[PDB]
Amino acid sequence: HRYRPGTVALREIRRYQKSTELLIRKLPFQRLVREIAQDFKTDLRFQSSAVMALQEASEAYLVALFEDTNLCAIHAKRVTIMPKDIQLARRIRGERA
Amino acid sequence: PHRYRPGTVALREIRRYQKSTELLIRKLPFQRLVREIAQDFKTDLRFQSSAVMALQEASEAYLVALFEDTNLCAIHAKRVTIMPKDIQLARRIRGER
Amino acid sequence: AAHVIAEDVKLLQFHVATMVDNELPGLPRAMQKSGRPLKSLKQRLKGKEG
Amino acid sequence: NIQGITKPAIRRLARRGGVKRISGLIYEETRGVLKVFLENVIRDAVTYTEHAKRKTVTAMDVVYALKRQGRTLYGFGG
Amino acid sequence: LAGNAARDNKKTRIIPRHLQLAVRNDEELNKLLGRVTIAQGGVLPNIQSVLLPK
DNA sequence: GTCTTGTGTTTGGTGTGTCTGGGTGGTGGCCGTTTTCGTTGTTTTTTTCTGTCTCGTGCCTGGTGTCTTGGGTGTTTTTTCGAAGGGGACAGCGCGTACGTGCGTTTAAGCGGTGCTAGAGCTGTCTACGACCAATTGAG
DNA sequence: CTCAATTGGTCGTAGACAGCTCTAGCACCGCTTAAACGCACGTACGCGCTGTCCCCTTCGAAAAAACCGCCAAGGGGAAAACACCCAAGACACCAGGCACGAGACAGAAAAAAACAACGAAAACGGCCACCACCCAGACACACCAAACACAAGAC
């Protein structure tokens, strides 16, 4: 049969809040990191542990941002989070000016 | 007779107070409140008038910032202004309790 | 007036189509305003007695 | 590179974030915000690395950058 | 920045108004001082366009 | 199908270690010239005041438009769409009573004038204390 | 296995700490009136919704085509109403500027208090010797990093 759209979503939320491993693929993140750092300094090296620490901080930051954004959407009474939600979120956090 | 339409005066007021910088709370009420709260922590504390005024400046600027965030929460579906749900939201986005 | 020109061309489209097919689906059948529907060029040759 | 943060990866994160329904526009927004984030963090980390005269960015450099940013991370030494 | 704000306020003495205006008008000073509260600074004049009459 | 996985291994860059030693900053005394604070004079800000600007509410003159109307000639089988299911985003417009503008009354905030006092902070005396040290031990 | 933890002791001074006052923060009255309250009122924007828009689908709905031959002879009606004026006009609803209510504020005088200038005390800031240990640099290891390659697999 067909699962009514949105019924697997909650299941996935339940899984991914149960799970705790990192959710971005390790090498692609690492390469994005090396790229960004190259812009600041050439011939840089990273400890693997340092890259994993960056990924941890980045993911946990993003998770908290998504949480806040979701709350904004709910305040919009929207199930669907939107860029305007992220903007409002960060704005209230005072990240973006 | 004469009557400004709704919010005409309110806008004029906002313009006014954003032009000015005085304390918006009446001082002596605030001072009494501070004394009351402190009494809950410790009896027989003397407050430098300057220390009071400092607490007042902080409280006012903090609440004004909070109102700013709250009014930013108004934004969706061209909804207008602020309700306690908005306050609660903004505070939680800040991570305040 | 770009407003009205749209309606003018819509009505021209109605007349020209009804010249060659009176029996459009949904569109009002062109008529001699006293009742009788207009025999379009399709109808001149459409079926039996074409 | 940036698109290496795949749509499924961002979905997975937002699901961990409890997001039920996602506008596709969220993916590029997430990439932009994550880029800004990394930018700041890495800039601080390299600035420690530069001060240490190192070429290797260490885990401690990242920790100290996050400690500055108000993002204190436990797991790699304090 | 604060002296320029004072000048355009047509005042010779920089007062906390002007310090706050300067600090918030420059985005970079605002980032350096984003958590700071300035006594008697008030706010930048800013009304959300939603609020303005059409 | 994809080119990430992450194990497996390669090899050498560079990080960190240890060793040397003299450049450096700290310590100390000493001088001195700078800084702070107290007093006096003034110029800029603020207050009360006049007044005129100005923009809002909406009054007012009367204009741009309109729509009434006297007179009327003529204005059963086959295809394929494109529905519906399954769900949100949003939202136009209705409803309605919340809270804005007002006003009249009541309050007590503010001024400020005056009294009091206690403990903030200063200064002076003593030594409990933490730093340094040599000699000692075993916990990580 | 070893050097960071440990001890008894001295030093000398941090700060206990006790006194001392007089700062300024406590109460207090009391008159003024800005602001608070409260009430009326209403209109606008917080509530509501189902209109509908989006992804994917089939599939059943409208569409639309077809449905003796031909042949005879009635007896209707073809509106013409009323569209759409033409046209002339008085009629709104529309300008828009009148006009000044009420506020804002601009310009002025005046008061005053902020703050500029002058003089005084003193401790901080600088000069010098001199100290030594810190940190630079050198020389070295080695390991952890990049890198290559493959597996299986996340997309």
Residues of E in contact with A97 (CB under 8 A): 27, 30-31
Asked if C50 and C44 count as a contact pair (C-beta separation under 8 A), the reply is yes
Q: Which helix (H) or strand (E) holds A80?
A: strand A80-81
Angle (nearest 5°) at CA B21 between B18 and B27: 125
Give nucleotides in strand G with any atom < 7 A to a protein C-beta: 24-26, 35-36, 43-47, 55, 62-69, 77-81, 101-105, 114-116, 144-146, 154-155
**Beta strand ranges found along D1-78 (DSSP E):** 21-22, 56-57
Q: Is the CB of B18 under 7 A from strand G?
A: no
Q: Does E25 touch chain A (CB under 8 A)?
A: no
Question: DSSP letters along C9-50, please?
Answer: HHHHHHHHHHHH-S--SSSPPPB-SSSPBP--HHHHHSSTT-
As to burial, measured by CB atoms within 10 angstroms (0-12 exposed, 13-18 middle, 19+ buried), residue D40 is middle
Burial A31-45 (b: 16+ CB within 10 A, else e): ebbbebbeeeeeebe
Strand G contacts (CB < 7 A) among D residues 12-71? 56
Q: Is the CB of A41 under 7 A from strand G?
A: no
Q: Is the CB of D9 under 7 A from strand G?
A: yes
Looking at the DSSP assignment, which residues form a beta bridge with residue D57? Answer: A46
The phi and psi torsions of A2 (rounded to 5 degrees) equal -115, 125
Determined by cryo-EM
* Least CB–CB distance from B93: residue in A76, A84, A89: A89
Asked if D42 and A36 count as a contact pair (C-beta separation under 8 A), the reply is yes
Residues in chain E: 54
Nearest CA among D52, C46, D21 for reference residue A12: D21
- Distance in Å from F18's C1' to D56's CA comes to 22
Interface test with D, best of A20, A24, A27 (most D CBs within 10 A): A24
For chain A, which domains are there? Answer: 1-97 (1.10.20.10)
Final resolution, Å: 3.0
Residue-range domain boundaries for chain D: 1-78
Asked if A62 and D17 count as a contact pair (C-beta separation under 8 A), the reply is yes
The residue type found at A96 is R
Residues of D in contact with A82 (CB under 8 A): 23, 25-26
Q: Is the CB of A27 under 7 A from strand F?
A: yes
Q: Does A15 touch chain D (CB under 8 A)?
A: yes
For residue C27, give both structure tokens.
Answer: 């569109």
Q: How far apart are CA D75 and CA B14, in angstroms?
A: 49
Domain D1-78 has CATH 1.10.20.10: yes
Nearest CA among B43, B59, D48, B89 for reference residue A40: D48
Report chain C's C-alpha Rg in angstroms.
Answer: 13
Q: How far apart are CA B83 and CA B90, in angstroms?
A: 11
Nearest CA among B48, B84, B9 for reference residue E53: B9
Looking at the DSSP assignment, which residues form a beta bridge with residue C37? Answer: C31
Strand F contacts (CB < 7 A) among B residues 34-53? 44, 46
